[PDB]
Amino acid sequence: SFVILFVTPLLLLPLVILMPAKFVRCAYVIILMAIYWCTEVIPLAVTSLMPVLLFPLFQILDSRQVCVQYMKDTNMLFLGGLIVAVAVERWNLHKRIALRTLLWVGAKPARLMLGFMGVTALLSMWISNTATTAMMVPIVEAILQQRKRLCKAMTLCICYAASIGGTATLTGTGPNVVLLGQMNELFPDSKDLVNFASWFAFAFPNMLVMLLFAWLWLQFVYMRSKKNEKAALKVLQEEYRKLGPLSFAEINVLICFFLLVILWFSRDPETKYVSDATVAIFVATLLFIVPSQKPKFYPPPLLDWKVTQEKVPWGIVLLLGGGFALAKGSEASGLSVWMGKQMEPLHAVPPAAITLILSLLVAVFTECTSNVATTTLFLPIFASMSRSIGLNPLYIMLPCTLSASFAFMLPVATPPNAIVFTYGHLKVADMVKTGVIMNIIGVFCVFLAVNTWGRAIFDLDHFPDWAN
Amino acid sequence: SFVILFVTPLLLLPLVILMPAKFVRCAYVIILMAIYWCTEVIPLAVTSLMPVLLFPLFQILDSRQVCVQYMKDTNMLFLGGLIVAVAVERWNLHKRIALRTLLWVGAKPARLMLGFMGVTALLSMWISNTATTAMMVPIVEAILQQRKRLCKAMTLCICYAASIGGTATLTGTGPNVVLLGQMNELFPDSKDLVNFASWFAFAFPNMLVMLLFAWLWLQFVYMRSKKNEKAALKVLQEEYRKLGPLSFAEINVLICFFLLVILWFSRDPETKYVSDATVAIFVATLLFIVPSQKPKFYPPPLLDWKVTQEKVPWGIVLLLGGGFALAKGSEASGLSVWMGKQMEPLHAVPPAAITLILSLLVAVFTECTSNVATTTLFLPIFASMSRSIGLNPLYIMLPCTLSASFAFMLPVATPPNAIVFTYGHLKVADMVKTGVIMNIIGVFCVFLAVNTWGRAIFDLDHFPDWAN
Ligand SMILES: CC(C)(C)c1ccc(CC[C@@](O)(CC(=O)O)C(=O)O)cc1
Ligand SMILES: CC(C)(C)c1ccc(CC[C@@](O)(CC(=O)O)C(=O)O)cc1
Ligand SMILES: *[C@@H]1O[C@H](CO)[C@@H](O)[C@H](O)[C@H]1NC(C)=O
Ligand SMILES: *[C@@H]1O[C@H](CO)[C@@H](O)[C@H](O)[C@H]1NC(C)=O
Ligand code: NA
Ligand code: NA
Ligand code: NA
């Protein structure tokens, strides 16, 4: 039942009030926040707000030293991305790109599945995986209403494509922002090593491989009659024409998005001040002053504030802050040092086995919790391991955060799967059967990526000095 | 027109790019953000996000040193207050307290006005002045539909009562939180001198005086037939019974609110860690696990997350951060020192005249802009003045922030007045005529308060050492 999850663990709080060793107190905080992460008896952001409420009582950190960790460059970056995504959503743009791509590739189940997967991934690279699948599934439903395995195939394709595309852009989804925050906190001498450009270079090639493998696996398991070609076009056309002409505002938001991309990349092809958060905020601001209509007086702009107050995941701006506060408390108390001293004997196990095992463990784990909690709970542990054995932490921290996005079964794993399920014929057993193999595929692809071309970018074959 | 406000000022940006003196650059940033404060061509939060976008370009602060100033104890305090206010709003509680008070005082225009003003003030002490007036005006409309001066009187009473009650609790409204943030930033050795208790002691007596004077002034200007007594009761009763019985959840939220009050006060009747933000977060968290219904299984709690994501002013969590970033940039660049050296000659003007003049200036100013922008623009200036002449900064910083809430004409001054106007018969001239006198009243009351009983609490007759 739901009662025990937050009444029995609290009963241990008087146990550890004295506990003349702060790292025990920080460990209890982390364990409690993890127990509340996996089961949502209490929402995620509320659990993120717990460190300010517990570190003081445990005499670890003051209230200010804890709260001033809840906003940093990473949160601003994610917030700017979210606002741009709101601008994209308000004007039905993505529903235009998608419905043009579908009419381009064709109306054939083999090609139609590829179109849906590719579109969903490309959108999810910037558009908050949940939202893009929420937008795309209705199109699939409309098509289907006009065997029993095509339905499952397409429904799974939406979610897998979203979860895979998300792990290409540093914004993408929470886990990558969490990685950036942990790198800035634990390893601050890494001024800018995981940027938008570096992460995009390391990860974008990977998601193409994962998408190809997923498409092959799906068309092998569920696909192993011209009406379904001549009656899906009659739906795509009649759901495309409803969008009207090119909608002048869409052009301006597209231009702003391209400017955002160009500024993110061109920046990194003397006392830098101008990190990517500045760019994201710049474009988010520009979105409020652009006309959105032909002046012929300045017509109503692209974005009001009501829209971006109603439609913005603000809780994921506190969740990452909770992660950062946890990292700060771990550094202050002495938990990271203890974990480092308790993981020396791993100096004999070869690093590749460590990376593979931990990636598989994280992939299994994230089918129960959310994909952000997994990272903010695991990454400090792997970072402490790496310092103590003589590795470059990125070796173990990149595949882990890529794997945390491998939620391919257990609808509870990530919202997209739940959204896909809500529509009917996607019995859960099918998800498990088709998702275990996809988790294996993702782990193999990630291992290949990190061991082949992620070593030249980050120099993972040497032990640096920003990890003392 | 709206075009010039954000295309001509930007044209000065290339002028000051070089400008081998950082304080000029910080001054330009502040002036631009002020110009965008007064006229809302670009929303307020977006302007608050500007420092991260401009200080880097001007080589004042990095992006992290700027963004890590956007969350602090004050923002958490205000956020907890906001969440509790959401819990109050979701269950129509305040509409129960109010409609019981109205039936208690009576149905007579003289007594009815007092009931409305007192209720609106008491609610606004915790409930985000805008929201309480939004809730209360419909009751007045319902009553009126069943001379032409009663309408104006009641409509003005709602807004004046809200704006006056807000300035009693440290949360209350933005200006007081801004004062707390500026005290923590500019004067950090003032560990805890303006708390909830101290501010409540200094300000709560003042708002009773202001409410009494406002009620007298209104009943003198607009009030200088038993049907209006026997047909407002027939409305209050029929709008009270619709609320049903005491609504078990209301009891629990009331208990949580009382616990919040008791924890805020009892705390201050060795290396403190437990500032009021901890209490606010504690109660905000408790609001998510309390049943909200009789278990008889844990029924749905008082607060979900959808409700507190839809209904929470998140932008005022970035606005205060913008204020703090401005203060940090002023300290870093060298603008505060310059302003201190340019305000020595005021060492001859007696302090009381300074306080009165500045309070009146701020009261006039805040009839154009918002009440938060005024404080975050003025308070650093007054703080720099005080250090250089030999005063206790609170002397000039308390009345200024109390006066910034004196928006009693010019609907654009603060949202409550606009809400009141939207209902009809409140011609603007009436607002000016009845508001100039009320601004004078507020200034006089504030001067009396600070000069009589605000000197013992804060020791304003000596120059401390937390102001070097
Ligand atoms: C509680 C709120 C509403 C603030 C919230 C928190 C976390 C997410 C996760 C979004 C995700 O990153 C998926 C993932 O991380 O599992 C994606 O892009 O779909 C979404 C919303
Ligand atoms: C832009 C958003 C929506 C974030 C926003 C900003 C500022 C306020 C002010 C609230 C005020 O403090 C009045 C006052 O300060 O003028 C009160 O309590 O009514 C309200 C909302
Ligand atoms: C930094 O490096 C020094 C030299 O090995 C090491 O002793 C010290 O513990 C390290 N400090 C941190 C904060 O990593
Ligand atoms: C603190 O006090 C010293 C002594 O007067 C003064 O010289 C110095 O400028 C002050 N520093 C700050 C940061 O106020
Ligand atoms: Na995404
Ligand atoms: Na998951
Ligand atoms: Na208020």
Ligand code: NA
């Ligand atoms: Na105002």
